[PDB]
Coordinates of C-alpha atoms (C1' of nucleotides) in Angstrom, one line a residue:
Chain Y
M21 CA 140.9 279.1 97.0
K22 CA 143.4 276.7 95.4
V23 CA 145.5 274.1 97.3
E24 CA 148.3 276.6 98.0
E25 CA 145.8 279.0 99.6
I26 CA 144.2 276.3 101.8
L27 CA 147.5 274.8 103.0
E28 CA 148.6 278.2 104.3
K29 CA 145.5 278.4 106.4
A30 CA 145.9 274.7 107.4
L31 CA 149.4 275.1 108.8
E32 CA 147.6 277.4 111.4
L33 CA 145.7 274.4 112.7
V34 CA 148.6 272.0 112.8
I35 CA 151.6 274.1 113.8
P36 CA 152.0 274.8 117.5
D37 CA 151.9 278.5 118.6
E38 CA 154.9 280.2 120.4
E39 CA 153.3 279.6 123.8
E40 CA 153.1 275.8 123.2
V41 CA 156.6 275.6 121.7
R42 CA 158.0 277.7 124.5
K43 CA 156.2 275.5 127.1
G44 CA 158.0 272.5 125.6
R45 CA 161.5 274.1 125.3
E46 CA 161.2 274.9 129.0
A47 CA 160.3 271.4 130.0
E48 CA 163.0 269.9 127.8
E49 CA 165.5 272.4 129.3
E50 CA 164.5 271.6 132.8
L51 CA 164.3 267.8 132.1
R52 CA 167.9 267.9 130.7
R53 CA 169.3 269.4 133.9
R54 CA 167.6 266.9 136.1
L55 CA 169.1 264.1 133.9
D56 CA 172.6 265.6 133.6
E57 CA 172.7 266.0 137.4
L58 CA 172.4 262.3 137.6
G59 CA 174.8 261.7 134.8
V60 CA 172.3 259.6 132.9
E61 CA 172.9 258.6 129.3
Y62 CA 169.8 259.5 127.3
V63 CA 168.5 260.7 123.9
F64 CA 165.4 262.7 123.0
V65 CA 163.4 260.9 120.4
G66 CA 159.9 261.2 119.0
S67 CA 158.2 264.1 117.2
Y68 CA 159.1 266.6 119.9
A69 CA 162.8 266.0 119.3
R70 CA 162.3 266.6 115.6
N71 CA 159.8 269.4 115.9
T72 CA 157.1 267.5 114.0
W73 CA 154.6 267.1 116.8
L74 CA 151.0 268.2 115.9
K75 CA 149.6 271.2 117.6
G76 CA 148.0 270.3 120.9
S77 CA 149.9 267.0 121.2
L78 CA 153.0 268.1 123.0
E79 CA 154.7 265.1 124.7
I80 CA 158.5 264.6 125.2
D81 CA 160.0 261.2 124.7
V82 CA 163.2 260.4 126.7
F83 CA 164.8 257.1 125.9
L84 CA 167.5 255.9 128.4
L85 CA 170.4 254.2 126.7
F86 CA 171.4 251.1 128.6
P87 CA 174.5 248.9 128.1
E88 CA 173.8 246.0 125.8
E89 CA 174.7 243.3 128.3
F90 CA 172.2 244.4 131.0
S91 CA 169.2 242.2 131.8
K92 CA 165.7 243.4 131.0
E93 CA 165.1 243.4 134.8
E94 CA 167.8 246.1 135.3
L95 CA 166.5 248.3 132.5
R96 CA 163.1 248.4 134.2
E97 CA 164.4 248.8 137.7
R98 CA 167.0 251.5 137.1
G99 CA 164.7 253.0 134.6
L100 CA 161.9 253.1 137.2
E101 CA 164.4 254.7 139.6
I102 CA 165.4 257.4 137.1
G103 CA 162.0 258.4 135.9
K104 CA 160.9 258.5 139.5
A105 CA 163.6 261.0 140.4
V106 CA 163.3 263.2 137.4
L107 CA 159.6 263.7 137.1
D108 CA 157.2 266.0 138.9
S109 CA 154.6 263.2 139.0
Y110 CA 155.0 259.7 137.8
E111 CA 153.0 256.7 136.7
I112 CA 154.1 253.3 135.5
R113 CA 153.0 252.4 131.9
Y114 CA 153.3 249.0 130.2
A115 CA 154.2 248.3 126.6
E116 CA 156.3 245.3 125.5
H117 CA 157.9 246.0 128.9
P118 CA 157.1 248.7 131.6
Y119 CA 158.4 252.3 131.5
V120 CA 157.5 255.5 133.2
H121 CA 155.2 258.3 132.3
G122 CA 154.9 261.7 134.1
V123 CA 154.9 265.5 133.9
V124 CA 157.6 268.2 134.0
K125 CA 156.8 271.9 134.1
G126 CA 153.3 271.1 132.8
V127 CA 154.2 268.7 129.9
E128 CA 153.7 265.0 129.3
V129 CA 156.9 263.0 129.4
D130 CA 157.8 259.3 128.8
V131 CA 161.0 257.9 130.3
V132 CA 161.6 254.7 128.4
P133 CA 164.4 252.2 129.1
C134 CA 166.0 250.7 126.0
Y135 CA 169.3 249.2 124.9
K136 CA 172.1 251.3 123.3
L137 CA 173.1 249.3 120.2
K138 CA 174.8 249.8 116.9
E139 CA 173.2 248.0 114.0
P140 CA 169.5 247.1 114.0
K141 CA 170.3 243.4 114.4
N142 CA 170.1 242.6 118.1
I143 CA 166.9 244.6 118.8
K144 CA 165.2 242.9 121.7
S145 CA 162.0 245.0 121.8
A146 CA 160.3 247.6 119.6
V147 CA 161.6 250.4 121.8
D148 CA 165.1 249.5 120.8
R149 CA 164.4 250.1 117.2
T150 CA 163.2 253.6 118.0
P151 CA 166.7 255.2 118.4
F152 CA 167.6 254.0 114.9
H153 CA 164.3 255.4 113.6
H154 CA 165.2 258.7 115.1
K155 CA 168.7 258.7 113.8
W156 CA 167.5 258.0 110.2
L157 CA 164.9 260.7 110.5
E158 CA 166.6 263.7 112.1
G159 CA 169.1 264.5 109.3
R160 CA 166.5 263.9 106.5
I161 CA 163.3 265.4 107.8
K162 CA 164.9 268.6 108.8
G163 CA 163.3 271.5 106.9
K164 CA 160.0 269.6 106.2
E165 CA 158.6 269.5 109.7
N166 CA 155.4 271.5 108.8
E167 CA 154.8 269.2 105.8
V168 CA 154.7 266.4 108.4
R169 CA 152.2 268.3 110.5
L170 CA 149.9 269.0 107.6
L171 CA 149.8 265.3 106.9
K172 CA 149.2 264.5 110.5
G173 CA 146.4 267.0 110.8
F174 CA 144.8 265.7 107.6
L175 CA 144.8 262.1 108.8
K176 CA 143.7 263.0 112.3
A177 CA 140.8 265.2 111.2
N178 CA 139.7 262.1 109.1
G179 CA 139.9 259.5 111.9
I180 CA 142.9 257.6 110.6
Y181 CA 146.0 258.9 112.2
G182 CA 147.1 256.5 114.9
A183 CA 148.5 253.0 114.1
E184 CA 147.0 251.4 117.2
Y185 CA 144.1 248.9 116.9
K186 CA 141.4 251.4 117.7
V187 CA 142.4 253.2 114.5
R188 CA 144.5 250.9 112.3
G189 CA 145.8 254.0 110.5
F190 CA 149.1 255.8 109.7
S191 CA 151.6 256.0 112.5
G192 CA 153.6 259.2 113.1
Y193 CA 156.8 257.4 111.8
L194 CA 155.0 256.4 108.7
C195 CA 154.0 260.0 108.1
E196 CA 157.6 261.1 108.3
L197 CA 158.9 258.4 106.0
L198 CA 156.2 259.6 103.6
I199 CA 157.4 263.2 103.6
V200 CA 161.0 262.2 103.2
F201 CA 159.9 260.2 100.2
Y202 CA 157.5 262.6 98.4
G203 CA 159.1 265.8 99.7
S204 CA 155.9 267.4 101.0
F205 CA 152.2 267.0 101.9
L206 CA 151.0 268.0 98.5
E207 CA 153.2 265.5 96.7
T208 CA 152.3 262.7 99.1
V209 CA 148.6 263.5 98.5
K210 CA 149.0 263.8 94.7
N211 CA 150.8 260.5 94.4
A212 CA 148.7 258.7 97.0
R213 CA 145.8 259.0 94.6
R214 CA 147.6 256.4 92.5
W215 CA 148.2 254.0 95.4
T216 CA 146.8 250.4 95.1
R217 CA 146.3 247.6 97.6
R218 CA 149.5 246.3 96.0
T219 CA 151.8 249.3 96.4
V220 CA 155.2 249.1 97.9
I221 CA 157.2 252.2 98.9
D222 CA 160.8 251.4 99.6
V223 CA 162.3 254.6 101.1
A224 CA 165.9 253.4 101.3
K225 CA 165.9 252.5 97.6
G226 CA 163.8 255.5 96.7
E227 CA 161.5 253.2 94.8
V228 CA 157.9 252.2 94.3
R229 CA 156.9 248.8 93.1
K230 CA 154.1 246.2 93.0
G231 CA 154.0 243.8 95.9
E232 CA 151.4 241.4 97.4
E233 CA 150.2 244.0 99.9
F234 CA 150.6 247.7 100.8
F235 CA 154.1 247.7 102.1
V236 CA 156.2 250.7 103.3
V237 CA 159.6 249.1 104.0
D238 CA 161.4 250.4 107.0
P239 CA 164.7 252.1 106.1
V240 CA 166.2 250.6 109.3
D241 CA 165.0 247.1 108.5
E242 CA 164.0 246.0 105.0
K243 CA 162.0 243.0 106.4
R244 CA 159.6 245.3 108.4
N245 CA 156.5 247.0 107.0
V246 CA 155.9 250.4 108.7
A247 CA 152.2 250.4 107.5
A248 CA 151.7 246.8 108.7
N249 CA 148.7 247.8 110.7
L250 CA 147.1 250.2 108.2
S251 CA 143.8 248.5 107.4
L252 CA 142.8 247.9 103.8
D253 CA 139.7 250.0 104.2
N254 CA 141.6 252.9 105.9
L255 CA 144.1 252.8 103.0
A256 CA 141.1 253.0 100.7
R257 CA 139.5 255.9 102.5
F258 CA 142.8 257.8 102.5
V259 CA 143.3 257.3 98.7
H260 CA 139.8 258.4 98.1
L261 CA 140.3 261.4 100.3
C262 CA 143.3 262.5 98.3
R263 CA 141.4 262.4 95.1
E264 CA 138.7 264.6 96.6
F265 CA 141.0 267.1 98.2
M266 CA 142.8 267.6 94.9
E267 CA 139.6 267.9 93.0
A268 CA 138.2 270.5 95.4
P269 CA 140.7 271.6 98.2
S270 CA 139.0 272.8 101.4
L271 CA 140.1 273.8 104.9
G272 CA 137.5 271.4 106.0
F273 CA 139.8 268.4 105.4
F274 CA 141.8 269.5 108.4
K275 CA 139.0 270.2 110.8
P276 CA 137.6 267.3 112.9
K277 CA 134.0 266.5 111.7
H278 CA 131.2 267.3 114.2
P279 CA 129.6 264.3 116.0
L280 CA 126.4 265.4 114.2
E281 CA 124.1 263.7 116.7
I282 CA 120.6 262.7 115.6
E283 CA 117.4 262.6 117.6
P284 CA 116.4 259.0 118.2
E285 CA 113.0 259.7 116.7
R286 CA 114.5 260.4 113.3
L287 CA 116.6 257.2 113.7
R288 CA 113.5 255.2 114.5
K289 CA 111.8 256.5 111.3
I290 CA 114.8 255.7 109.1
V291 CA 115.0 252.1 110.4
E292 CA 111.3 251.9 109.7
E293 CA 111.8 253.1 106.1
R294 CA 114.6 250.5 105.7
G295 CA 112.4 247.7 107.0
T296 CA 115.5 245.9 108.4
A297 CA 116.2 244.3 111.7
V298 CA 118.5 246.6 113.8
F299 CA 119.8 245.2 117.0
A300 CA 122.8 245.2 119.3
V301 CA 124.5 242.8 121.7
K302 CA 125.3 244.5 125.0
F303 CA 127.6 243.2 127.7
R304 CA 130.1 244.6 130.1
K305 CA 133.4 245.9 128.7
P306 CA 136.3 243.7 130.0
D307 CA 138.8 245.7 132.0
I308 CA 141.6 245.5 129.5
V309 CA 143.5 248.0 127.3
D310 CA 142.1 249.3 124.0
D311 CA 144.8 247.4 122.2
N312 CA 143.5 244.1 123.4
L313 CA 139.8 245.1 123.5
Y314 CA 139.2 246.4 120.0
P315 CA 140.6 243.4 118.1
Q316 CA 138.3 241.2 120.3
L317 CA 135.4 243.4 119.5
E318 CA 136.3 243.1 115.8
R319 CA 136.5 239.3 116.1
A320 CA 133.2 239.2 118.1
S321 CA 131.2 241.1 115.5
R322 CA 132.7 239.1 112.7
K323 CA 131.8 235.7 114.1
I324 CA 128.3 236.8 114.9
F325 CA 128.0 238.4 111.4
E326 CA 129.2 235.2 109.8
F327 CA 126.6 233.3 111.8
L328 CA 124.0 235.7 110.5
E329 CA 124.9 235.1 106.9
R330 CA 125.1 231.3 106.8
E331 CA 121.8 231.3 108.7
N332 CA 120.2 233.3 105.9
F333 CA 119.4 236.4 107.8
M334 CA 121.1 238.6 105.1
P335 CA 123.1 240.9 107.4
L336 CA 124.1 244.2 105.7
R337 CA 126.9 245.5 108.1
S338 CA 128.0 245.3 111.7
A339 CA 129.5 247.8 114.0
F340 CA 130.6 248.0 117.6
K341 CA 131.3 250.5 120.4
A342 CA 132.9 250.5 123.8
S343 CA 132.0 252.8 126.7
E344 CA 133.5 253.0 130.1
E345 CA 130.5 251.0 131.1
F346 CA 129.6 248.5 128.3
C347 CA 130.3 247.2 124.8
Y348 CA 127.9 247.0 121.9
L349 CA 128.0 244.9 118.8
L350 CA 125.6 246.3 116.2
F351 CA 123.8 244.6 113.4
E352 CA 121.4 245.3 110.6
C353 CA 119.8 242.5 108.6
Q354 CA 117.5 242.3 105.6
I355 CA 115.4 239.5 107.1
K356 CA 113.4 240.4 110.2
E357 CA 111.7 236.9 110.2
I358 CA 112.3 233.8 108.1
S359 CA 110.1 230.7 107.8
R360 CA 110.5 227.7 110.1
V361 CA 110.8 225.3 107.1
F362 CA 113.9 225.2 104.8
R363 CA 115.1 222.7 102.2
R364 CA 118.1 220.4 102.9
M365 CA 119.9 218.9 99.9
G366 CA 120.2 215.1 100.0
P367 CA 121.9 212.3 97.9
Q368 CA 121.4 211.8 94.2
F369 CA 118.8 209.2 93.3
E370 CA 121.1 206.5 92.1
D371 CA 122.8 206.4 95.5
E372 CA 120.7 203.7 97.1
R373 CA 122.9 203.5 100.2
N374 CA 122.8 207.2 101.3
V375 CA 119.2 207.7 100.0
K376 CA 118.1 205.0 102.4
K377 CA 119.9 206.7 105.3
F378 CA 118.6 210.1 104.2
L379 CA 115.0 208.9 104.3
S380 CA 115.5 206.9 107.4
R381 CA 115.4 210.1 109.4
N382 CA 111.9 210.9 110.6
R383 CA 110.8 214.4 109.6
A384 CA 107.5 216.2 109.8
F385 CA 107.2 216.6 106.1
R386 CA 108.4 213.8 103.8
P387 CA 111.3 214.4 101.3
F388 CA 110.9 214.9 97.6
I389 CA 113.0 214.6 94.4
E390 CA 114.1 217.5 92.1
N391 CA 116.6 217.4 89.3
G392 CA 117.9 213.9 90.2
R393 CA 118.3 214.2 93.9
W394 CA 116.4 214.0 97.1
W395 CA 115.6 217.1 99.2
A396 CA 114.2 217.2 102.7
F397 CA 112.1 219.8 104.4
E398 CA 113.6 220.8 107.8
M399 CA 112.6 223.0 110.7
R400 CA 114.6 225.8 112.3
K401 CA 115.2 226.3 116.0
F402 CA 114.8 230.1 115.5
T403 CA 113.1 232.4 113.1
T404 CA 114.5 235.9 113.8
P405 CA 118.0 237.3 113.8
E406 CA 117.8 238.3 117.4
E407 CA 116.6 234.8 118.3
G408 CA 119.5 233.4 116.4
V409 CA 122.2 235.5 118.1
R410 CA 120.8 234.9 121.6
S411 CA 121.4 231.3 120.7
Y412 CA 124.8 231.7 119.1
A413 CA 126.2 234.1 121.7
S414 CA 125.0 231.8 124.5
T415 CA 126.8 228.7 123.2
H416 CA 129.7 230.1 121.3
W417 CA 130.8 232.8 123.8
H418 CA 134.3 231.2 123.8
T419 CA 134.9 232.1 120.2
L420 CA 134.2 235.8 120.6
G421 CA 137.7 236.7 121.9
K422 CA 139.2 235.6 125.2
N423 CA 138.0 238.5 127.3
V424 CA 134.9 239.7 125.4
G425 CA 133.9 236.1 125.2
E426 CA 134.2 235.5 128.9
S427 CA 132.3 238.7 129.6
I428 CA 129.4 237.7 127.3
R429 CA 129.4 234.2 128.9
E430 CA 128.7 235.9 132.3
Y431 CA 126.1 238.4 130.9
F432 CA 124.6 239.8 127.7
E433 CA 121.4 241.0 126.2
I434 CA 120.0 241.8 122.8
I435 CA 118.6 245.3 122.5
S436 CA 116.3 246.5 119.6
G437 CA 113.7 249.1 118.8
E438 CA 113.2 252.2 120.9
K439 CA 115.2 250.6 123.7
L440 CA 118.3 250.5 121.4
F441 CA 117.9 254.1 120.1
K442 CA 118.5 255.1 123.7
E443 CA 122.0 253.5 124.0
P444 CA 125.2 255.4 123.3
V445 CA 125.2 253.9 119.8
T446 CA 123.2 256.3 117.7
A447 CA 126.4 257.6 116.1
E448 CA 127.8 254.2 115.2
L449 CA 124.3 253.3 113.8
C450 CA 124.1 256.3 111.5
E451 CA 127.6 255.6 110.2
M452 CA 126.6 251.9 109.7
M453 CA 123.4 252.7 107.7
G454 CA 124.9 255.6 105.8
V455 CA 122.5 258.0 107.5
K456 CA 123.4 261.3 105.7
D457 CA 122.4 264.9 106.2
Chain Q
rG17 C1' 145.3 239.9 123.1
rG18 C1' 144.4 239.8 117.7
rC19 C1' 146.0 238.1 112.8
rC20 C1' 148.8 234.3 109.4
rC21 C1' 151.0 229.3 108.5
rG22 C1' 151.5 223.9 110.7
rG23 C1' 151.2 219.9 113.6
rG24 C1' 148.1 215.9 117.7
rG25 C1' 143.9 214.8 119.7
rC26 C1' 138.2 215.1 120.2
rG27 C1' 132.7 217.0 120.4
rG28 C1' 128.4 218.5 117.4
rU29 C1' 125.9 218.8 112.8
rU30 C1' 125.3 215.9 108.1
rC31 C1' 123.2 210.7 103.5
rG32 C1' 128.2 211.9 103.5
rA33 C1' 133.3 215.9 106.9
rU34 C1' 140.2 216.6 106.1
rU35 C1' 136.0 219.7 103.8
rC36 C1' 130.7 222.8 107.8
rC37 C1' 130.2 224.6 113.7
rG38 C1' 133.2 224.4 117.7
rC39 C1' 136.6 222.4 122.1
rC40 C1' 141.4 220.8 124.2
rC41 C1' 147.1 220.0 123.7
rU42 C1' 150.9 221.9 120.4
rG43 C1' 155.3 224.3 116.6
rG44 C1' 156.7 228.8 114.1
rG45 C1' 155.7 233.8 111.8
rC46 C1' 153.6 238.7 112.5
rC47 C1' 150.9 243.2 114.6
rA48 C1' 149.6 247.3 118.4
rA49 C1' 152.6 249.5 122.9
rC50 C1' 157.4 255.0 121.7

RNA sequence: GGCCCGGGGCGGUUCGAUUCCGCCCUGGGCCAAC
C-alpha cells in the first residue's frame, strides 16, 4: 500500500490493452500503404508515434512535409486533397490554418499540412514546430513511455491535463519534457512538491532556476514556455496534489472523481445557512469554439465580479458554465441588500474653492464635516446584487467579451432561488461554495 | 478570441481624473489549435 504498489495498479488504468494497441497498429499500417501508394512525404508525430498515448485516447497524427517555398494556400489545398483520398471519412478542422480529420479502420486520424524545415527558425505556424518537438522526443523518451502515461492519467483524473483554455493545464508535450527531466512519474511528483510560482525548468540545460514566472523552456526554442498556459491556480493544485499523494498514496488519484450530484433541496438549505445572495446570469451560448468561448466567459465573470466588489456587495467567488444551450455566470455575495444611503468623501475644509462646488450640489441630506473634511450622503440607484448586475450587464455588455457580450446584449436574465437550483449549475455551485460530503 | 505593453482621440462619473467606469481609431508582444 506504498507508492510502488499503487503505481503498478495505476499503469493498468493508463496503459492501453493489446486490443487497443493492435487496433492502432492496424490503422497505422493501413494508413501507411494508402500514403505510400500516393508517394506522399509524411511523418507520424504525436503520442501515438511515441507510444505514450493514454488508454482510451488513441488518435494518429500524420503531418505532411511540404517544401519550404510553397504558399500556405498550397499546403491547405494539396493537404485537403491527400487527407480526402486516404481517409475512410473526412472532416475539415481549423487551427491556425485548416487541416483534415477522419477515420481509418476505426481510429481517429489527423492529416496536418506543415512545412519541412531544418532549424526551428522559419517556423510559420505552431504546426511547423511539432516535427522538431517529435524529433527531440523520440530518442529521449524511449523506455519511459509508461511513466508519461502515469503522469497523464494523474493530471486527467484531477481535471488539469489539457493545455487548452477550458483547462489551462499541462499539455501532453509538457508531460513528456517532464519525464525526460525527472526520469519518471514518481520523481516528477516528488520534486513537483518543491515547485514555486517562480520555478523555471530548462530541459536543454538540465537545470532548475528562479524566474519571474513558472517557465518550462522549450528544448527546440529557448524563448518559448511550454507551460505558458498553465494557470497559477492549476499549478498550485498540482503541487498540492503531489504533496498529498506522497503523504498517502492511493489509486484514487488516477480515477476520475464522480460528479457527486446533490439534490437541489439540500443546496437550497446550504445557501440558506450561508445567508448569502446566490444568483446567476443566463444568456445564450455564442456559436464559437471552446477556445474562444471560455476566455470570454472568464472575462465576463471577472468584470461583473469587479463591479460587485467596488459596489460593496462583498462577492465571495464567481463561476461559470456552458451548455449546448446556454451559458451561466454564477455569483455568491455576502450582502443580499445594502442601504440606499452611502457616504461620499469630499474636499478638506481649508479648500474653499472645491468645498463650495461640493456643497453646490443639491442632495436630499446635507453634508457634514468629519476629521477635517466634508462628506456627503448619497443615494444608490440599486440596493441588491441582482439589481446591480441587471444594470451593469445591460449597459456594459460590450466589455464582457466580443461574442458573450453581444449575446448578453440581445438577451439575458438573472436567476436566483429555487429557480436557479433547477439549472444545470448545481455542480459548479457546490464547487464554488466548497460544498463537501 | 483572450492576455501583456504603447500610442491618438472622446463619453460618463467626480470638488477634483493621466488616476475611477466605459467607447472609438491605432503600434508591438504572447497564448490555445497538433
